[model samples]
Target: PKTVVVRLSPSMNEEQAAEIGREAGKAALAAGDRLVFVGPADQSYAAMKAAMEAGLPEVTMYALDFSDAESALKAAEVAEDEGDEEVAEVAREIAEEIKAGG
Candidate 1:
């Protein structure tokens, strides 16, 4: 299964923001679904629950926060641009989390 990881960051402009996204996105790709990179949309409980149920990592609301569960792939694409192979590792981490019912 293609893995996808939803990154939850607090700041976007931060130097590590892109790296964080790249690493996480690559990780997701390594696991399943193909990393789509969702959103820094919100940090509401309901949203988090829905995202979890939908098989996404629980992340804080910021930068690439855990607001959406269906965009890890897109984010991975960006990570690829940045040349981060570890991105696949993050995706696999998320896939494993969801598989374990986290």
Candidate 2:
């Protein structure tokens, strides 16, 4: 796979989310890979560090976070309207997932 996207549950906070990123990041790999974290906040930094320090150069990470449903909704749609078709689907799915309370 090329992209990894994680979402913080409604019950979990930034700290909780970070740990999820941390341990697991050490397991994933390779060049030009994209690891994305979506949550109430960007807890992806810990994960990013793990993935990068785990191996060679050039694995990218993305932290897509939102304060609430409305904010998530806006970001998702705009992402679709603005760029890649790839970007569009994931953004929409995130918004829907959060909205569905997943």
Candidate 3:
């Protein structure tokens, strides 16, 4: 199945994201359900860490860290190449916002 992207919402704290990532790492992989995220690194560290705790590479299913603009843009392209435009679009948005915020 195609991957799913989560745009970290203000309402959702990093702790919650962390748990989801931890649980998702197991459930998602077993089910072949992929996930990606778009958010500021300062805000997304826990989730990123938790995904790794799930035994996946920290960046394997990256939470498009807003700390870098190009990385997320490239990730956006990768998402497109993988034919998951939903992730691509959100990543593009985060990449631009990353630039815009600077």
Candidate 4:
């Protein structure tokens, strides 16, 4: 399968940007993609730390520009719309990983 990366931006500097990334990561993980990389913009160190502190999923925040943000999320939305039981079943593994802090 082809791999796609989505960039999500919070339209905020460092902190807020990071939170948005975490949200996107969580969403993508739910959609079934393990992030091997995450960067190039200011992110929310606080959000990441919180996830860790709370023993939450393995989510990271990455900096993103407007175009990147728009495209990434739009693609994810499409995946949800198109995915059926099998795809969703596979996606559930990702959710488990996230829930288990993968």
Candidate 5:
């Protein structure tokens, strides 16, 4: 399975972020692809999830414990430790995503 990570700017308000997420969800459905949102613990994360859930209940949401480097690394570690290779792969890929975006 392919996972696309959606990242929102911290500068945007939660409501606005969620609206964009919902729009993305619509696009995802039309393209026959699943939408997933990944973010560290933050108000925007919850807003994204809420909007996505309302518009596309099937959308998957992944969370990092907190908005920090250590939290992200630990999530990958936990996935690997639990033998979830696919999730671990996605987690690693997200690291690349962040780097690429920056």
Candidate 6:
């Protein structure tokens, strides 16, 4: 099956995020899907390992070469310009919160 790569949000705990991924995988399985998380090397591998340990064995993990937060902020701008208002709004809020450092 093909992998579904996703960005890891800094605000989430690895275990918690893994659990969410597992749930997502369960849902996606209905339509034949596989999930992979692309994140910072330190966090991504551990998160993937944690997910496997927690029972989602099919989950795959990869280390992303760039900053997820920075890219997401830029994505917010692009999403706005592209008329993807929902994505833009959420991305904007997330980017703002990350920049606010809270």
Give the alpha-carbon lDDT of every model.
0.43, 0.55, 0.60, 0.42, 0.58, 0.54
Model 5 global lDDT (CA atoms, 0 to 1): 0.58
Model 4: lDDT equals 0.42
Those runs of model 2 whose alpha carbons end farther than 4 Å from true positions after fitting are: 1-40, 81-87
Local lDDT at 87 for model 1: 53
Q: Ten residues in a row with the worst lDDT in model 3?
A: 58-67
> Which has the better TM-score: candidate 1, or candidate 4?
4
Tens-digit lDDT track of model 2 for 23-97: 446544534355555434345555455445665244343345466677767766665575445555666777777
Native RMSD of candidate 1 (Å): 14.5
Return the TM-score for each candidate structure. 0.28, 0.53, 0.53, 0.30, 0.54, 0.43
- Write the number of the candidate with greater TM-score, choosing between 4 and 6: 6
Which candidate tops lDDT? 3
Candidate 5 local Cα displacement, residue 102, angstroms: 10
Root-mean-square deviation of each candidate, in angstroms? 14.5, 4.0, 5.0, 12.5, 4.7, 6.2
TM-score of 4: 0.30
Candidate of highest TM-score? 5
Candidate 5 error regions (>4 Å): 1-4, 8-12, 43-54, 79-90, 93-102
Between which residue pairs do clashes occur in model 3? none
Residue 90, candidate 6: C-alpha displacement in angstroms? 15
Which ranges of candidate 4 are over 4 A from the true structure?
1-4, 8-11, 36-41, 44-102
TM-score of 5: 0.54
**Cα RMSD (Å) between model 2 and the true structure?**
4.0
